[PDB]
């Protein structure tokens, strides 16, 4: 006799354990697996480290203030410089992988807040200018937070990205973003959110450096509140774990 609020996940040499949680969302009903022999196209044999990549990598934390719009991360770009996962994708031409997103935010009973955790495949984002397109290193961030911004970004001759939270940078309603696998963190109940995503693409394998399969978004629908005295610094932490990752086309390093 145990409580469904307690969960443990073991991958590689890493573990996470939760005291309070909701459940696990499993993507589109699909658990990530390897590439079959009737779906593959590349001839040469794939490499599969199986343990040195498929573990938990913990990205930098972000402070949740009373006026934070939200944050976004590119899952392929985020683990580019972390561990052996980054090194394998650097040398190889083709990479295929799945992920899981455990987001942790812990607060006391007195603190009240709401966070939406959703994964968006092909989350193409628009530029502030209508004529030009968003520049790299402006949309992408290495282990970086990349927060949004209430109110429109000024229009001028600059490859700045439109960061409006209500349009989410894609021009769609922020509320309707529940169509993709989503989990809600309610400080009064849920402490963390777990999402498992299978590899989703229109091709069997893709170049990790020039294309991003999915974009993790954390958006506070209801702000953070408390009374004078309680702790003000409330951080959010994100851990990503590649699942059933395989690589092809070994060559000289670089991108």
């Amino acid at each position: 006799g145990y409580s469904d609020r307690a969960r443990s996940i073991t991958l590689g040499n890493s573990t996470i354990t939760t005291q309070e949680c909701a459940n696990v969302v499993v993507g589109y009903g699909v658990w990530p697996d390897y590439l079959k022999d009737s779906e593959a196209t590349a001839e040469d044999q794939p490499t599969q480290p199986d343990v040195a990549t498929c573990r938990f990598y913990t990205l930098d934390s972000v402070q949740w203030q009373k006026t934070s719009p939200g944050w976004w991360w590119k899952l392929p770009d985020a683990l580019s410089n972390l561990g052996l996962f980054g090194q394998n994708m650097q040398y190889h031409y083709l990479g295929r992988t799945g992920y899981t997103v455990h987001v942790q935010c812990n607060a006391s009973k007195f603190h009240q807040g709401c966070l939406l955790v959703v994964c968006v495949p092909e989350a193409e984002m628009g530029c502030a200018t209508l004529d030009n397109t968003p520049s790299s290193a402006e949309l992408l961030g290495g282990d970086s937070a990349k927060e949004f911004a209430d109110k429109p970004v000024a229009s001028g001759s600059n490859k700045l990205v439109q960061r409006v939270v209500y349009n989410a940078g894609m021009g769609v309603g922020v509320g309707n973003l529940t169509i993709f696998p989503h989990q809600w963190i309610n400080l009064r109940t849920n402490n963390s959110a777990t999402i498992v995503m299978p590899y989703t693409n229109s091709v069997p394998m893709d170049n990790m450096f020039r294309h991003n399969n999915v974009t993790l978004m954390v958006i506070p629908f209801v702000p953070l509140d408390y009374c004078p005295g309680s702790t003000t610094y409330v951080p959010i932490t994100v851990t990503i774990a590649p699942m059933c990752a395989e690589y092809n086309g070994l060559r000289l390093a670089g991108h």
């Binding site: 909701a22 459940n23 969302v25 589109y28 590119k74 495949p121 092909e122 989350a123 193409e124 984002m125 628009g126 530029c127 200018t129 209508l130 004529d131 397109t133 968003p134 790299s136 992408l140 429109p152 439109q162 409006v164 209500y166 349009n167 894609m170 021009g171 769609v172 309603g173 922020v174 509320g175 309707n176 973003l177 529940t178 169509i179 993709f180 696998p181 989503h182 989990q183 809600w184 963190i185 309610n186 109940t189 849920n190 959110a193 989703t200 229109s202 091709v203 069997p204 170049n207 450096f209 020039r210 294309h211 991003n212 974009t215 991108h255």
Partner: protein, 267 residues
Amino acid sequence: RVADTVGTGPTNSEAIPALTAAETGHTSQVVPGDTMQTRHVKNYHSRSESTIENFLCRSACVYFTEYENSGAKRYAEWVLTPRQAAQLRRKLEFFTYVRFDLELTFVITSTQQPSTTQNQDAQILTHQIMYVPPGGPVPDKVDSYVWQTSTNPSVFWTEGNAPPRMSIPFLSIGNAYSNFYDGWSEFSRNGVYGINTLNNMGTLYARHVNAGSTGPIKSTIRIYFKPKHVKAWIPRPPRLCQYEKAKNVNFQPSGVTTTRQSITTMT
């Protein structure tokens, strides 16, 4: 066919269908019979018109252009793209990846332009529509040797009959058309960002085979797409902001919805 409503009665128990947790995605699968007394009602309504095939399989104008029979603009050209219009594009952008055969229809109409020539007794106009694949030779002028159409598929039409219709097989190097692409064509990540990178549908050329008169005449062609045998994956939310360009998703931030007077106002 839709499910039929059943009949329940008064209940006093520990069961809690209504109370649940929306923290989990789990969309509550409750029915009215759980929070009230219902009668048995057979439901003969059928979920038929809502299928993706019935939703997408209808002709829709995507581009209309002009050409003349004299002067400088003597032929017309258009790279194949469904993002020129808004109605067809919005419907297709409910999904991330689509895979469908295409039925093509054309509507060609001519109009006698104002001039001062006399004794204009025109003949029937014949028009030729030619497709160039990504890499095929393109006609420099209206009397170029390209129109020989040895291998390129072409069609000839004599003004006055039923419009010309042809069917096109799923043309792609991938396994599904991609409505949205997040990435670049170049590895250095400095160039064209967006779906534009993936698109490669070739070019379409239309022209007058004969002049037909001494006075000026301007013809116009309208192109109609019909998706057949549709498959679709990974749905996404409908476009709120109005479209700006055809190559990208550039938009202007707009209100989430329209406003009323109060929070208790019924209008």
